[PDB]
Each structure stands twice: as C-alpha cells, then as structure tokens.
Design a protein around this ligand. Structure first.
Ligand code: SAH
Ligand code: SAH
Lengths: 297, 297
C-alpha cells in the first residue's frame, strides 16, 4: 500500500477538493450543529490538511482545536495553513485508534470524510467516545455518494484545442494510477448508507442528520475570483505533484506522455485564468455530504 | 395523459415530499439567494400546492407572492394552506406559457422542480423574463438526480410483520401505476445537468448556483414530533387517495389487493405513530437540490 499523502491524495488535492464542499454562508450553521460554542475545545480525527478543523474555529466563538492525522505531509501543511490564517488550531501526528489524550479532554469530537476510510471504525468511534466529555457531541461528515448526483463536463469554446486531448490523456494516466494504487484499501470503513445506524449502534443518543449540499464550477458567479484563482493554483500543483510521484517510482507512463499531460494541464489552467470573468463552460458537479451527530454517555 | 393532480402527484403527495426538502434553518439563506427583500412581490410558476411559495413569504420581510399552476386541486389546496397560516400569498389557476400579467409586474420570479417538467422550457423562461422587472432575479430549484444519492430501507424490529409484505405489495401496485400513468410525459423539460447552461443560454446574467441538501427519515432527532406526525398523516392520505383514484378507473388491481395494501399502509402508520420517540429503523434517503439564479436585462 502506497503512502496516502503522496500517491493517493496529496495535500494540494485535499485542499482543492475540500475548498468548495461547504458554502461560506453555511459555516455558522455547521458550527452550531457540531456543538461549537464559547469555551469549547474540539478534536478533529483524521483531519488531513485541516480543512474542517479550520472551518470550525474560523468563527467569532472562543474555541480551540486539535487536529490529528497519521500523515506527516498533511500535518505539516495544516500547520502552515493555520499559522498563515492566525487560527487557534494545533496539529498533531498520531493514530485515531490510539488517541494521545486522557479521557474527557474534549467538549466536541468530529471527523470529515473519515469514518468511510478507517479499517476499524468501531475502535475509532470507541476512541472518540473515550476522549469526549460525558454528554458531548460526536459528529461525522461523509459523502452521500462517491459519484456526483449531477454532472456536466461543460462546453468550452471551439478555439480550445486542449479540451479533447486532455480528456483523453487524463483517463489514460488515471487508469494507470488506479492499477499502481488501487482504491479499495482506502474505503474499508462505514458505508455511506450505514452511518446513522452505526451511530445508534455505537450507543450514541439523539442521533441527528443534516445534509450539506455541495457544488463545484468555475463558471459560478457566486464564487469569488480569489477562490477561483486559488483553486486553479491548487489544481495545477495537485496534478503535477501526483504525476511526478508516480514517475519517480515504474507504472507504464512514458516521459513523452508526462510532458504532454503537463503541457495540457498548463493550457487548461491558462485558459481558466484568462477567462476568470467570462467562463461559461459550465463544467460542473454537485451533490451532498451528510452530517451525523450524536451525544455520548 | 392522466390529470396530474389526481393520478401522478396528488396534493398530499406534494406536501409530504416537499416538507423535508429544505431545513427550516436554511429558509433565510434561500430567501436571500432568490432575492427576497422588503417590498418585493414575487411570482412562483408551477407552484403546485405552494410549498416554495409559502417558504419564500414566511419570513419577517415585507413581501407578497402570487403562485400560478394549471391544476385546480393544487390551487385549492394552496389557498387552504396559505389561509390557515395567515400568509401573504395569492394562488391563481393559469398557464406558465401564457402568464395573465403585464410586463415588469414582479421583482422576483421563481419555480420549484418545474423547469424539469415543462414541455417547452424556452417559452416558460421567456414568460418569466417578460413578467420580471428589468434587472430582477429569476430563480429555479431542480433535483440534482431522480435517484437519491444515498439510501437505506431501514431495519425495523423483528416483531413488525407488515414490513416484508408491504415492500412486496408497494412495488407490485406501483409497477401497475407506471403502466397506466407513464412517467416520461412529466419529464420533458431541462435535464438536471443542463439548467445552468440553460440560464446563460436564455440570456440571463451573473448566473449563480447554490446546492440545497435534503434528507428524510422519521428516525432523525433534529425533526420535530409535529413534523413527523404531520408527515405520517400526509403519507397515509396520499397513498390511499392515489390508490382510490386508480380503482375508480381498470388497471389490474383486485379489490382484495387494495384492501391488503390499505391494511398494511395503516399498520406502518400505526407503528410510526407509536414509536414516535424511539424509531431507530433508519429508513432514510438524501441528496441535494440545485438552486440557479440569474439576472434579466
Ligand atoms: N488510523 C488513523 N489515524 C489517524 N489518521 C488516519 C488514520 N487512518 C486514516 N487517517 C487519515 O484520514 C484521512 C481521510 S480523508 C482527509 C480527511 C480530512 N478531514 C479532509 O476532509 O480534508 C487521511 O488524512 C488519512 O491520513
Ligand atoms: N404549462 C403549465 N402552466 C402552469 N403550471 C404547470 C404547467 N405545466 C406543469 N405545471 C405544474 O408544474 C408543477 C410541477 S411539480 C410541483 C411543483 C411545486 N412547485 C412543488 O415543488 O411543490 C405541477 O404542479 C404542474 O401542475
């Protein structure tokens, strides 16, 4: 099995794919539903690059957070991110199955797209229950489906010659990635449909569900330029680093192929940058994540 | 083609299936995104029983609304509903393709799960553009998928003998309904994935997308008893009225079958009522709807 933070999802990939999951305007609601509130200290388990960690501590409330993850690269990045934004969040390398804390340390315990992944969700939940204070809220956000509920590849202007080639190269190189790094190891946890049942089954009380819609497109007028430009940077960087990591291994990608793929990714990004205000391609994707909370005794 | 409000979706069916689409807590956000604001008068096109109409005028803002629909039963019900709740909404029988109003009557024009349905969405949109004031917001909410993104039939206690029989009878009677009333006539409009493209394609500007998550389950601790009890009533009534309408036609349902189906539906409802506080079946379903707005010139 290949190192998660290098070959499967690099730090930039996590940042680019999480950025648009939850509208800015939903943050106070999501904070409230997870039990964020004055003088709350929270733990975010498998925090990756700290996306959800940041979201929860980004309000006006007097809160602090610890994020824990197995991947050194994720923790490094999370620290850099939090430090940059001045946020009260600590990031720590460690194991979900073996939390380096005493019982009843945290008011709130959460995880984001994590219970889906762990080989042993019962034990992880057992840890979350141990470390939360009596009567505190444990929350999980998980994908409702691995497929998007709706999807359009978009229609780019006819001038754009990179569109067909890149589509072709992308699912050629990516099928090669799926060989060398199979997905089935990463999705050993609680099935999407089973999470609510899992919560009451682990003894949690007042089990509550809240859907959280998600949408992606650079054509969206309600998304800031800054966010679009930040996404484009992260997309470029995430694709190039993933490719390079696989080259430095061999998996069946010629150097000509790689330079082609680089060139095309570069052309897409250049087009997206140049058409920041008038991108009407509607390459778009949506669906919903599911928030589940329960109280521990 | 069978009368929509009788054979396809009766007023109670619309109320039961819309009730849980949008969390109460999202109402101010959804109002804002559609351009609801003081001294706004709005039109809701194909308003059905007036679900979305009610949602938009239910805030503190000084707003009023007209709902328009082809179905007399929907309009009747909408009136009864609005009158009961004291809401500033008028409901009118009429045609989306032929709006009984002058140009520039409304500040805002909206529709909910409608652009998906109309045989001629271009003309409907043309009407919406005509009737909205210059620079006003046209909005549409549509399903992201006809399937739910996630799903669990649930695990009812072993004592419940109605569970297996009803599953069996439901998709037996319903396959008979799909024969006598085929679905394909009702879904002649804009494909889910095409709505954003449709908006810019119809000349609308600053086209904006907002996902709206949805979830259903009577096991949810965050849903009020009152809402659960109201859902159960509507479910009972919607199923019985649909069945009766089809009996009064012949479609291949014996009277024994009907009385069986009645009995079972009744037993499910009795169980749901009796287990209002301790339903841990997790019969649940979720996904997201998509809100699209654009400005008219
Ligand atoms: N046993 C374990 N202990 C700690 N972290 C783990 C773990 N197993 C998996 N992880 C981490 O779980 C994460 C799943 S996905 C990334 C999750 C992050 N919350 C986000 O949405 O951005 C990965 O970061 C992975 O490194
Ligand atoms: N040409 C037309 N003019 C007016 N209403 C129409 C129409 N074609 C379809 N409708 C109505 O469009 C609706 C679609 S579904 C019900 C929509 C309602 N907004 C809700 O979500 O509860 C039906 O009520 C149907 O009667």
């Amino acid at each position: 099995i290949k190192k998660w933070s290098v070959y499967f999802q690099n730090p930039e990939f996590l940042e680019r794919t999480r950025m648009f999951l939850i509208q800015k305007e939903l943050y106070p609601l999501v904070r409230n539903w997870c039990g964020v509130k004055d003088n709350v200290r929270l733990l975010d388990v498998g925090c990756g690059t700290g996306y959800f960690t940041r979201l929860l501590v980004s309000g006006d409330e007097d809160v602090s957070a610890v994020g824990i993850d197995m991947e050194e690269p994720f923790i490094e990045y999370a620290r850099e991110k939090a430090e940059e934004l001045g946020l009260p969040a600590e990031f720590i390398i460690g194991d979900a199955l073996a939390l380096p804390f005493e019982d009843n340390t945290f008011d709130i315990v959460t995880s984001h797209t994590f219970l889906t992944s762990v080989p042993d969700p019962e034990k992880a939940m057992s840890e979350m229950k141990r470390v939360v204070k009596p009567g505190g809220i444990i929350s999980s956000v998980t994908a409702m489906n691995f497929m998007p509920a709706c999807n359009n590849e978009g229609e780019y202007p006819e001038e754009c010659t990179w569109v067909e080639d890149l589509k072709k190269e992308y699912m050629k190189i990516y099928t090669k990635y799926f060989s060398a790094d199979p997905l089935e190891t990463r999705i050993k946890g609680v099935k999407c449909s089973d999470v609510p049942k899992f919560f009451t089954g682990q003894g949690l009380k007042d089990v509550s569900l809240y859907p959280i819609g998600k949408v992606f497109t650079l054509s969206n007028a309600a998304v800031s330029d800054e966010d679009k430009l930040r996404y484009i940077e992260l997309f470029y960087a995430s694709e190039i680093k993933k490719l390079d990591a696989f080259m430095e291994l061999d998996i069946g990608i010629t150097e000509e192929d790689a330079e082609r793929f680089r060139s095309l990714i570069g052309q897409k990004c250049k087009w997206l940058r140049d058409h920041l205000h008038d991108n009407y391609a509607w390459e778009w994707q949506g669906g919903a994540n599911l928030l589940v909370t329960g109280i521990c005794n």
